[PDB]
């Protein structure tokens, strides 16, 4: 059947998208975006894969293509993910400082009412190459 549960919890930041061969991945105590919202212990987090389509009735397709948000470390009530837990699409980043506990209460954020925040990485830290994020430009 359809599912409607009252939990928004959307990404505080904007999409990453991939163009490339692999999906995505941050090295050791990097690959957290500049968090502007939040502690230096609420940095820990981890990027969901995401895609979009739609069912066009003469078979059309958005094909939206392959991106990531950022998500704060267990967000989502029953999300049931501590650090490190191996799920598909999941890429769990923590800087130094950060903590090893739950940190939903950032995640609370709707759409409806803010706009997400152009995903940006800190100063000496760069994308993976094939990667840029949405409302990011270079030059000007």
């Known amino acids: 059947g359809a599912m409607g549960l009252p939990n928004n919890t959307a990404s505080w930041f904007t999409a990453l998208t ?13 690959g957290v975006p500049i968090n502007t919202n939040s502690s230096p212990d609420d ?20 094909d939206l293509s392959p991106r ?23 890429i769990w980043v923590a800087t130094e400082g950060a903590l090893n506990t739950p940190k939903d209460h950032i995640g609370t954020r709707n759409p409806a009412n803010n706009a997400a925040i152009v995903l940006q990485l800190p100063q000496g830290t ?7 994020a949405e409302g990011s430009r270079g030059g000007s």
């Open 126 to 132: 760069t994308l993976p190459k094939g990667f840029y």
């Open 18 to 30: 991939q163009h490339g061969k692999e999906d995505l991945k941050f090295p050791r105590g990097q």
């Open 68 to 90: 990531w948000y950022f998500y704060y470390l267990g967000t989502g009530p029953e999300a049931g993910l501590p650090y490190g837990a191996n799920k598909d699409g999941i």
């Open 43 to 62: 940095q820990i987090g981890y990027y969901r894969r995401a895609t979009r389509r739609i069912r066009g009735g003469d078979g059309k397709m958005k």
